[PDB]
Amino acid sequence: MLDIALLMANASQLKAVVE
Amino acid sequence: MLDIALLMANASQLKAVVE
Amino acid sequence: MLDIALLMANASQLKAVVE
Amino acid sequence: SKKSAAESMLDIALLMANASQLKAV
Amino acid sequence: SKKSAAESMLDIALLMANASQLKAV
Amino acid sequence: SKKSAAESMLDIALLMANASQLKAV
Amino acid sequence: SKKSAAESMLDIALLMANASQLKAV
Amino acid sequence: SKKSAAESMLDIALLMANASQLKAV
Amino acid sequence: SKKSAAESMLDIALLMANASQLKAV
Amino acid sequence: MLDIALLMANASQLKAVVE
Amino acid sequence: MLDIALLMANASQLKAVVE
Amino acid sequence: MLDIALLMANASQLKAVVE
């Protein structure tokens, strides 16, 4: 019984607020 | 019995608020 | 019984607020 | 004059080479 | 004059070479 | 004149070479 | 009885985030 | 009875975050 | 009874975060 | 001038000569 | 001038000569 | 001038000669 679990969350957020 | 589970969430958000 | 679990969160956030 | 260049690129790759055998007598 | 260059790149790679055997007598 | 260059790059790599055996008599 | 199981799996991934600028006066 | 299990898995990953600028006056 | 299990797994990862600037007056 | 060159050869050869 | 070159050869050869 | 060169050869060879 080879039970493998895997949960690879990820995120990315760029922002360029010119005024 | 080879039970493999996998849950790879992902996200990305760019933004350019010129004024 | 080879139970392997794995949870690799991740994040990244760039920002360039010119005025 | 004012500019900006927000650039990014993500990538993912997965591989699962597995096998199994079973015998009863 | 004003500029900016926010640049990034992520990457992921996975590998799982497994196997199994079983016998009853 | 004013500039800026925020640059980055992440990377991940995984490997799992496993096996198993089992016998009953 | 005789068996065999030759198993394999290759993988490749590439990424190129580049840019450029140029001005003459 | 005789068995065998030749198993393998290769992987590659590349990343190139570059940039450039140039000005003449 | 005779068995064997030749198992292997290779992996590679590359990263190149570079930049450049140049000005003439 | 950002001259990047790249040459990644590769090979693999499995064999199971049962008699 | 961003000159990028790339040449990724590859090969694979399986064989099972039962007799 | 950022001249980068790269040449990553690779090889692998499995074999199971049962008799």
C19: nearest CA in chain F? F2
How close is the nearest chain E Cα to the Cα of H14, in Å? Answer: 9
Cβ proximity of I6 and H7 under 8 Å: yes
**G16-17/F16-17 β-pairing:** unpaired
Of C2, C10, C16, the CB nearest to E6: C16
| Structure-solving method | cryo-EM
Whether B14 sits inside 8 A of D8 (CB atoms) is yes
CB of E6 within 8 Å of a chain C CB? The answer is yes
Type of residue numbered L3:
D
Whether G6 sits inside 8 A of L18 (CB atoms) is no
Please state, in angstroms and rounded to a whole number, the distance separating the CA atoms of residues G14 and I1: 46
Cβ proximity of F17 and E18 under 8 Å: yes
Of J3, J8, J17, the CB nearest to K17: J17
As given in the structure block, the two tokens for residue E6 are: 């926010």
Resolution of the model in angstroms = 2.9
**D23-24/H16-17 β-pairing:** unpaired
Please state, in angstroms and rounded to a whole number, the distance separating the CA atoms of residues J4 and E6: 22
User: What SS3 class is residue F13?
Assistant: coil
As given in the structure block, the two tokens for residue G6 are: 């030759």
Please state, in angstroms and rounded to a whole number, the distance separating the CA atoms of residues G23 and H22: 7
User: What SS3 class is residue E17?
Assistant: strand
